[PDB]
Amino acid sequence: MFCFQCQETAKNTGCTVKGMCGKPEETANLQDLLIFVLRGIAIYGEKLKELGQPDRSNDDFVLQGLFATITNANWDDARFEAMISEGLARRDKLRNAFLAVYKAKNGKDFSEPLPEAATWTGDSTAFAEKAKSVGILATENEDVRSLRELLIIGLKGVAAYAEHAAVLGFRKTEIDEFMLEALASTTKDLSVDEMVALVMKAGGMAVTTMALLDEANTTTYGNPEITQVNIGVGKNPGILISGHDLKDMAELLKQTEGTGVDVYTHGEMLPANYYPAFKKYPHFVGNYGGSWWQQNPEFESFNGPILLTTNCLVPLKKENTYLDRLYTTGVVGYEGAKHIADRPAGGAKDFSALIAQAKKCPPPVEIETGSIVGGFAHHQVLALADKVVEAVKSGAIKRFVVMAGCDGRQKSRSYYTEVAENLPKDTVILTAGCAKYRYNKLNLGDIGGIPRVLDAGQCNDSYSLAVIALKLKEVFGLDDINDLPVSYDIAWYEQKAVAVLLALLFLGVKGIRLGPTLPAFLSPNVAKVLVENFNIKPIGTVQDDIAAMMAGK
Ligand code: SF4
Ligand code: SF3
């Protein structure tokens, strides 16, 4: 196999036998074949748009297919086989439409050779062998490989956010068109300039999509507000919801109301606690545990059903007993888990089986007590802008440090905890994404009532952090966003973080520290382009990085 799309990739080079995440060769290869088929869809879809007869019938399929290949999203080879077969059928429909339109517009049959992605077909028994030759290593040149895979990795992250927006009824044609432009581009022989421009365009589309998702989440569930979230437990059986999807949360809360089953969040569902639409339910207890990588013991000790709405779901340890109460939904899949089918148009998912099972479970084992404060998304922070601006001009706040992104397993991530602990007492940490769990249970206090850790929400709520920076740029009358008293020390793991990074680069943010390592999918020459254009940096020691950040470097 070959996969290098996450921070934990083997030797920071690539997983070649079995993924460090647990992904077996067969699964890895099937994900490659799915992406191959999506490239085929894209070739015809792009051509149809160019001919003035766009077909948007595959929009959701494309988003879901990309999302299913995110790290820790889908482990079920049966699901991939089904998606690949469906993809081939969708592709062939587009092919036939294209051929007819091309002939009408040109007065002759289409005759140009196409990449194999556009033409190869087989039944499911042919997939395993074909998959071996259509993956990342099919691109021989390391710079072409790096730029194509950077694009697809960023694109998957964008697709995830676009899927959540689509679930909520929010779509933009430009996003779905760009999915096909980007995918099709990776079958073409393009210059480095063209390939880099596509990556920058993806960053701009990450801005568009993150804005759309922010609109969707806040229009539907309200603006996040300051909330104190309990991290202890009650004495009722509960259902633990993890991942990111807020519509699943809305439906789970409605369906559990009055049943005697409590609802708890986990991981990237913590920010559901911040939304007024959800705060109204008394049986929504709070948040259980930490970030995704601790889930084996935590899902175990929770005792009730666990619902994974998105990544990250990790393989069960052999000693874990929660498979029989593990539920997947959306793009998530896991062999032997129970999957909750997609909602029908105008309807709702059916969580009744989780509720019935939860009534037979003991309540959660308490693993800590206390609280986490959050809800500082853009409406909330902009409301406080006068107070923040006066604190900066008076010197009470010397600097903001953006420490958003993803958590993960590697012990080097103690860096993030130590930075939070050792930053001067006149700084404020801004966060979003599960990177927060390295420092959100500390006792860092406040500056004149502004907490020293401001949690804007999920990784997608990095959007709020960008909105806040842009607003402060205006209030302070600065010409360059980088001259704000803000430093960026971002942790990354999976592909949504790459989308966020590309958005920040598109917005012109330079000097970002990215860690705890730099992506394996940046070739030396491509890394040089990013350093030259954007001054991206690796992490150093805690002491050195704090000093440099306080100096604005
Ligand atoms: S998702 Fe990450 S750990 Fe898993 S196979 Fe790919 S690079 Fe390796
Ligand atoms: Fe939405 S941030 Fe990226 S790592 Fe897996 S849930 Fe976390």
- Residue 141 CA to ligand 2 centre (angstroms): 31
The torsion region of residue 413 among left (phi > 0), alpha (psi -120 to 50) and beta comes to alpha
Atom of ligand 1 nearest to the CA of 5: 7
Q: Which ligand has the shortest distance to the CA of 332? A: 2
Residues with a CB atom less than 6 Å from ligand 2: 244, 267-268, 292, 311-312, 406, 433-434, 458-459, 493-494, 496-497
Sheet holding 427-431, edge to edge: 453-455, 427-431, 399-402, 486-491, 513-515
Please return the burial class of 461, using the count of CB atoms within 10 Å of its CB with bins 0-12, 13-18 and 19+. Answer: buried
Supply the residue whose CA is at minimum distance from atom 6 of ligand 2.
312
Q: Which amino acid is at 446?
A: D
Q: Which amino acid is at 356?
A: A
Pocket test for ligand 1, best of 2, 3, 31, 153 (most atoms within 8 A of CB): 3
- Residue 448 CA to ligand 1 centre (angstroms): 44
Report d(CA 326, CA 177) in Å as an integer: 35
Q: What is the dihedral of CA 377, 380, 381, 383, to 10 degrees?
A: 150
CB 202 within 8 A of CB 158: yes
With CA atoms as reference, report the closest residue to 6 among 491, 492, 334, 460.
492
- Residue 292 CA to ligand 2 centre (angstroms): 7
Report d(CA 19, CA 72) in Å as an integer: 11
Report d(CA 224, CA 221) in Å as an integer: 8
Atom of ligand 1 nearest to the CA of 19: 5
Report d(CA 39, CA 36) in Å as an integer: 5
Location of structure tokens 């960023």: 154
CA-to-CA separations, 28 to 9, 25, 265, 268, 311, in angstroms, rounded:
13, 5, 29, 25, 16
CB 187 within 8 A of CB 43: yes
Q: What is the dihedral of CA 126, 129, 135, 138, to 10 degrees?
A: -110
CB 523 within 8 A of CB 140: no
| Helix or strand run (H / E) with residue 451 | strand 450-451
CB 145 within 8 A of CB 139: yes
Report d(CA 246, CA 349) in Å as an integer: 13
Supply the residue whose CA is at minimum distance from atom 2 of ligand 1.
6
- Known binding site for [4Fe-4S] cluster: residues? 3, 6, 15, 21
Q: Are strands 284-287 and 371-374 parallel, antiparallel or unpaired?
A: unpaired
Cis bond before residue 516 (omega within 30° of 0):
yes
- Residue 136 CA to ligand 1 centre (angstroms): 13
Report d(CA 18, CA 393) in Å as an integer: 53
Residues with a CB atom less than 6 Å from ligand 1: 3-6, 8-9, 15, 19-21, 23, 28, 71
Residue 401 has what DSSP assignment?
E
- Known binding site for hybrid [4Fe-2O-2S] cluster: residues? 244, 268, 312, 406, 434, 459, 494, 496
Report d(CA 294, CA 337) in Å as an integer: 19
Reading the block at residue 139, the tokens are 């691109």
Close Cβ partners of 416 (under 8 Å, ≥ 6 residues apart): 403, 435, 438, 439, 489, 491, 516
Helical pair 59-68 and 25-50, crossing angle rounded to 10 deg: 150
- Residue 70 CA to ligand 1 centre (angstroms): 9
CB 238 within 8 A of CB 304: yes
CA-to-CA separations, 303 to 5, 233, 329, 362, in angstroms, rounded:
33, 12, 19, 6
Q: Which ligand has the shortest distance to the CA of 23? A: 1
- Residue 218 CA to ligand 1 centre (angstroms): 33
Location of structure tokens 């995704």: 292
CB atoms under 10 Å from CB of 282, counted, come to 8
**Terminus-to-terminus CA distance in the chain, angstroms?**
40
Close Cβ partners of 418 (under 8 Å, ≥ 6 residues apart): 542
Atom of ligand 1 nearest to the CA of 1: 5
Location of structure tokens 């996040």: 224
- Residue 310 CA to ligand 2 centre (angstroms): 9
Location of structure tokens 């790096």: 146
Report d(CA 483, CA 460) in Å as an integer: 24
- Residue 492 CA to ligand 2 centre (angstroms): 8
Supply the residue whose CA is at minimum distance from atom 5 of ligand 1.
19
Resolution in A: 1.5
With CA atoms as reference, report the closest residue to 83 among 71, 69, 94.
69
Q: Output Rg (C-alpha) for the chain, integer angstroms.
A: 23
3-state helix, strand, coil split of the chain in percent (to 5) is 50, 10, 35
How far, rounded to the nearest angstrom, does the alpha carbon of residue 126 sit from its chain's CA centroid?
31
Sheet holding 284-287, edge to edge: 284-287, 262-265, 238-242, 306-308, 326-329, 338-340
Residue 113 has what DSSP assignment?
-
Close Cβ partners of 168 (under 8 Å, ≥ 6 residues apart): 216, 217, 219, 220, 246, 247
Cis bond before residue 312 (omega within 30° of 0):
yes
CB atoms under 10 Å from CB of 324, counted, come to 10
Give me the domains of the chain, ranges plus CATH numbers.
1-139 (1.20.1270.20), 140-223 (1.20.1270.20), 225-375 (3.40.50.2030), 378-550 (3.40.50.2030)
Helix (H, G, I), strand (E, B) or coil at 328: strand
DSSP line for 512-526: -EEESS--TT--HHH
Q: Which amino acid is at 175?
A: I
Helical pair 25-50 and 77-106, crossing angle rounded to 10 deg: 20
